[PDB]
Amino acid sequence: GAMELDSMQGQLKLGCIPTIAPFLLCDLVQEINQRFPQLNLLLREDTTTNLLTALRHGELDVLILALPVEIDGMESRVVGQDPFKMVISRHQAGAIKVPIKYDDLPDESVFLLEKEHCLTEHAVSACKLTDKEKINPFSATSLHTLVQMVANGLGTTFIPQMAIDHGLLDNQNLVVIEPPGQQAYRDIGLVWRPSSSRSKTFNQLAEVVSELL
Amino acid sequence: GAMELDSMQGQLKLGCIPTIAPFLLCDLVQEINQRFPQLNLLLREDTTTNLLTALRHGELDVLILALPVEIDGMESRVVGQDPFKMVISRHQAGAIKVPIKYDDLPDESVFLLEKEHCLTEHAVSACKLTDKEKINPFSATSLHTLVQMVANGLGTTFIPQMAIDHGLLDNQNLVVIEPPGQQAYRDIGLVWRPSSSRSKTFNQLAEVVSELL
Ligand SMILES: [Cl-]
Numbered sequence: 001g002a003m004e005l006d007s008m009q010g011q012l013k014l015g016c017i018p019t020i021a022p023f024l025l026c027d028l029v030q031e032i033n034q035r036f037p038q039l040n041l042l043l044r045e046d047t048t049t050n051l052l053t054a055l056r057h058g059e060l061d062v063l064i065l066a067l068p069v070e071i072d073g074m075e076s077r078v079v080g081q082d083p084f085k086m087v088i089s090r091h092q093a094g095a096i097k098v099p100i101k102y103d104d105l106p107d108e109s110v111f112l113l114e115k116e117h118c119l120t121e122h123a124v125s126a127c128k129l130t131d132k133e134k135i136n137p138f139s140a141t142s143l144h145t146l147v148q149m150v151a152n153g154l155g156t157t158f159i160p161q162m163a164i165d166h167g168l169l170d171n172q173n174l175v176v177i178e179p180p181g182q183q184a185y186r187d188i189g190l191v192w193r194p195s196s197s198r199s200k201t202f203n204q205l206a207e208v209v210s211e212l213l
Numbered sequence: 214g215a216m217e218l219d220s221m222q223g224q225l226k227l228g229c230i231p232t233i234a235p236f237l238l239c240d241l242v243q244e245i246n247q248r249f250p251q252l253n254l255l256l257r258e259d260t261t262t263n264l265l266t267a268l269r270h271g272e273l274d275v276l277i278l279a280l281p282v283e284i285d286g287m288e289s290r291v292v293g294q295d296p297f298k299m300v301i302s303r304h305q306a307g308a309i310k311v312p313i314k315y316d317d318l319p320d321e322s323v324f325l326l327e328k329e330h331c332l333t334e335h336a337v338s339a340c341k342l343t344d345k346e347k348i349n350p351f352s353a354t355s356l357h358t359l360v361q362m363v364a365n366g367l368g369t370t371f372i373p374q375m376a377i378d379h380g381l382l383d384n385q386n387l388v389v390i391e392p393p394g395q396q397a398y399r400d401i402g403l404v405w406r407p408s409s410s411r412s413k414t415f416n417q418l419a420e421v422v423s424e425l426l
Pocket residue numbers: 017018046047048049116117118119
């Protein structure tokens with residue numbers, strides 16, 4: 001018979017936005033499988049506002065977000081920075097000169113995600129895109145289909161470095177360019193409820209995530 | 214000066230579901246860039262019911278769907294078949310024997326997308342998963358985070374072959390297994406309005422897509 005028998009044990013419900021989740025969480029899972037093998041991560045992917053509601057309502061324990069976004073009343077910790085690049089099709093790379101000058105781009109040549117995705121506000125502000133006439137009026141609804149439109153030669157867009165590092169551009173014959181701006185990156189952060197009893201778990205997770213960025 | 218001056222020219226608004234769009238549309242863009250270089254594809258990614266509403270309301274021209282789903286009143290053409298596999302973590306591959314016998318799996322060991330994603334009904338029916346007690350009650354909300362949970366060792370799931378062929382499992386230390394069933398695949402199809410004047414465009418696109426499957 002046998003005798004019947006800690007922060008990083010057990011189950012955690014973690015939410016993450018669509019422009020992060022496919023990239024960073026692959027690396028996070030591989031690290032915690034080894035370093036914290038009793039931690040089971042139930043994962044939810046949703047856009048920022050929906051994730052915040054789920055966190056406040058106790059449907060999720062912790063979020064991995066891009067910051068800043070509205071997180072009144074929550075506790076957060078910034079864990080690293082994720083650079084922005086621009087991308088254009090190799091077959092349009094000639095007809096667009098580098099360094100990129102937005103005034104030199106055609107009108108309606110910049111494609112962006114619908115505004116429920118925080119990537120659009122982060123990129124437009126961090127890369128100083130102030131001329132709204134360069135933005136195409138057709139809004140993209142996923143990072144993958146945004147990139148596919150650029151690969152079809154339709155214009156250009158801003159892409160986070162973690163997507164590039166995880167192969168998002170593979171086999172799509174794209175060129176990666178630096179945007180304008182001295183602070184062309186987004187912060188990445190973990191967000192949780194102040195009344196949680198699991199802050200030690202979240203801060204240990206925070207340290208793991210920071211090492212992936 | 215100069216003189217002022219056809220089915221596959223111009224702009225097309227195409228919608229596609231999240232368990233297809235990241236995979237197949239990369240290949241489709243590369244083929245049409247060469248074969249139909251004047252065809253500009255504006256892309257929308259959304260789940261099936263939302264896409265059908267957008268198609269009926271004239272907000273999109275044509276869809277690439279997994280079939281069968283409800284498409285009353287629309288015209289459709291099946292263009293190929295996309296096999297299903299199961300996946301498990303390499304570190305759990307021992308504790309699960311092959312051929313897979315669902316009765317031998319732990320209860321709650323099968324993770325599935327929320328039902329707005331047609332992959333769940335297609336996979337459960339085509340792979341003959343009849344025992345509901347094997348389904349984990351936590352529903353996944355994206356194909357990427359579904360796979361990450363399996364990579365974390367939490368259980369198993371069904372994955373379409375086009376995702377595997379496009380690298381979805383890379384670096385996640387997963388094993389690919391055959392499911393039960395003689396017809397473990399899903400159909401892929403294009404869907405459009407009967408009153409459209411662009412059927413010649415859609416059938417030419419249909420031929421291109423069939424060659425990618
Ligand atoms: Cl978001």
